[PDB]
Amino acid sequence: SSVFAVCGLGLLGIAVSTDYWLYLEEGIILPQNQSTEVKMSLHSGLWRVCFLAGEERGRCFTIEYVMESTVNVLKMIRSATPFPLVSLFFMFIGFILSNIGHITILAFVSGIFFILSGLSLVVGLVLYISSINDEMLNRTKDAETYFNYKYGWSFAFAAISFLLTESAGVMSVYLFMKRYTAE
Amino acid sequence: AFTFAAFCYMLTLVLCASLIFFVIWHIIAFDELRTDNIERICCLLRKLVVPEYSIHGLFCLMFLCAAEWVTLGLNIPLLFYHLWRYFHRPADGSEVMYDAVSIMNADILNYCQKESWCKLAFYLLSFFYYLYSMVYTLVS
Amino acid sequence: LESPYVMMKKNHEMLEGNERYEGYCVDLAAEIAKHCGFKYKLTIVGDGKYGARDADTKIWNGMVGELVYGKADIAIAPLTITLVREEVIDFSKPFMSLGISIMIKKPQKSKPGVFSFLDPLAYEIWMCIVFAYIGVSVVLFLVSRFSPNEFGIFNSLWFSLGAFMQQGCDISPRSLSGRIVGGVWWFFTLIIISSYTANLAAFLTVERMVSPIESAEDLSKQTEIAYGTLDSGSTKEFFRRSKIAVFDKMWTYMRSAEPSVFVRTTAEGVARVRKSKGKYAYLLESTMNEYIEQRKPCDTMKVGGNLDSKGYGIATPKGSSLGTPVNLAVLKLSEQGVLDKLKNKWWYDKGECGAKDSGSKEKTSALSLSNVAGVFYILVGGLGLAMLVALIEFCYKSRAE
Amino acid sequence: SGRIVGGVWWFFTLIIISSYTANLAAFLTVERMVSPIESAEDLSKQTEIAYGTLDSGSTKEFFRRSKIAVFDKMWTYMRSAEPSVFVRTTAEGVARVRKSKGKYAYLLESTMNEYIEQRKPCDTMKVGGNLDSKGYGIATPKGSSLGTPVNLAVLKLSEQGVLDKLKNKWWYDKGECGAKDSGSKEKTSALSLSNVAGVFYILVGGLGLAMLVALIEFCYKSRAEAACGRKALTLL
Amino acid sequence: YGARDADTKIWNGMVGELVYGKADIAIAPLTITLVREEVIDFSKPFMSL
Amino acid sequence: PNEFGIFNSLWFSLGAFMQQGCDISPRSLSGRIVGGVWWFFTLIIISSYTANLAAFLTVERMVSPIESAEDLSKQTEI
């Protein structure tokens, strides 16, 4: 129950820091199917969003301005930003109170904070993904252009940490179910 | 033309015809109290108290959602009455109220006998009032 | 140079002559030369900013900057017959007549809301169910209590909800009259779920769409969008002299518009619809709009129709002796249908579109998460209610001690 | 012996319900395909609806003469009338729409068509855009002395703002039918109560039966307090 | 309102009360068309159709 | 205020999402609401699923192959 808590903090911490949430492969088409080369292709993150093909320069920008569709997504990710932060808040609170219980309700209430982090992270993934399909649908249907959003490495850092928290969510209560019955 | 508020008048005729049946045991059990056993009628009539009151609390929530501001007014003093008749009384605290097994104290048999022909008065003409606004909306 | 009346085709980088500047009216120069006899000289106005004699300067602008001053005498081109232009110009009879038109962007699919899951059953039935939930949940309670009991209220808000999501029951009412309610409550759930599923199979198959800024009287009235339009020329000037009150409040909202009261360039006013797409509603003349809507991006659409009747007549600078060979020729091109034959030609040249492209071309997508996105908010938000009651249930047992 | 009756009745309730959710998703995706007529070239295909205009007016001349070739096909079926699709006059032309019950269309001028749909039996609507554009004119005989005074009048009466006040004057107040088109631009698509109504009547009528059965067993409970069944069964 | 027929039977309608000489000025819903243009005269268009 | 483990709560949860029954049947107002809205969540996802699978199959059945030249006269795609 300590190990799932220990592994839970780092995986989302990598995810909330890294710049590989979302891909993009905005290109074109030609007859004889002759598609494209790269035309506009960015990977993206949560705080630092780094272009890769449209200008090759990684303008990993503290998001307030430019450096057309991309920042429009980043205004919607801004609405979806706090829930991985809220999940990181209740994860660390659940981590500290778990070791204090190692040194009663002190360990049991930590398992409350694993779930309240995880339920923050489910809505965090939902509002993030529903933000993309908002901006997917605002992209005008066009035979030339195309759009290839792709969920990058950070979700396996993030959503697997949701499994880690809920594993640590249920370990803490059986920890409370083995310790209270000894009392 | 069936509407939502028209369904709220069909539903109360199903419910208030049982609410007039809640208060047919208000007056026949007092008929058994005036002819006479007390703790039997105490144990019986303490039960059907929150049923006959919270069904009335349902409709004030209902016609708010039905947005009928007329009939919301035409029962809100009884909800004010059902609240006020409630809250002073459960100081005995057995299950709810309305008997307090020494019910045979004076002046409370007749004050509830005022209520015996007050509920059977108000529910009966409202029963034909909900049937009035049922047909007023159903074929409009 | 404009849309299909006159433009420079790129073959003049090879070709010369009449083939420098081509289009509809360039063919019309041929069949008017069958009666007037006079040849062409395709001179695009470099100053072309259609205009009139300008405000407080009285200088004729652009095309009337070439036509009025004796620099030109025939004006076979798109030019609107204005009454203040009639003050300046002896015209001919109009080719065709246009109206003030609305170029709205082609309605792309709306973003479904967070609560778009309960679209296929209206906001009355989802209200009737909840009151017919309670109104049936209570009647099991009232039946099995005044009859010989595990049916509490809290067990009868569970049987009824246990049947509406079709999940069944282990309670299973045991009277005759407690089974009649639970009998025909089941048959209510067989029809509403099979009308929810049935209707949601009809949104996802035949998706008729809404063009919400149609029927231009409430384009002005229901003020929601950018009242974009062209610059100096005929369109603003008819609204400058607004005396029908429905157009005047439309004009004051263009008079109180910002920053794009006008912009410029019929080509650009297409593009400003094409890229803004949220509110820009480029308010141009009629027959240019059906060119853009037809051509092949198929991304604009004409809502409403023909707010005026304004004509395309050949402008002759006030007396201008060629006008009588001009207007008699046009009559022999109109009654013979030669101009109508030219209308039949030049508006069926390009790749045809409209509902013509909307033939047997559907591919329908899978549901995104944004279609059912609110159910997870109800699901997760349903959990934070039940864990809240857990602490309140645990509080009223510990403080019962 | 007793699970097979419950076996195939479980199969019978899978095919009837799954047939029922099939066709109820086949009314609703068929009567959603039905596009109303919205343009003349759409009406050019739709031979189901009868489209006749006014006889001996300018409109009958318009379909005969021009060659936009949607109209040539429109004139062609209009010339192949069965029976006579021209009516003779507009007031008789409204009634032929009124009495065909969504089967006779009637081509007429815009300024008249807007007034007809603003009349108390509101069951008409202006379908598409204008097929063309013309103008109303005040007529003088060919080269008479009355020509230019009236011609100077309408020029003067324009910028005085009177003739477009008259445009309002006999039309602006004429929404006396009520203008019910104003509250119907949603064209909503969910089921209403009108679709699923008989279920609630079965729902309420089930409750009204079940309370009376709850009464009829309580009285049978109390009257029971104050070979008999076999001979009663043997008779029945 | 006004039209033209087989020989001419002149201009059957309200223009038959106006080109025949039954009456002068013809304030009406009469619509300007080019067959009417050549046979009688008109004002400026005062409404749009 | 036992019969719910963590594995006996998986088996209720999977039981409700494929809409089959469950003998388990929770008992508390804290504990019936989780089973309440998960019962609502499994009504919208399945009824969305039988919607669109009856919308691929009634869309790709509408697709008429080209069979005549006047049909091909409209079909500018090919």
Ligand SMILES: N[C@@H](CCC(=O)O)C(=O)O
């Ligand atoms: N034909 C118009 C073009 C400009 C406009 O549409 O406003 C004119 O010459 O004024």
Ligand SMILES: N[C@@H](CCC(=O)O)C(=O)O
């Ligand atoms: N006012 C019209 C009526 C006939 C028509 O609508 O074509 C006319 O004089 O020609």
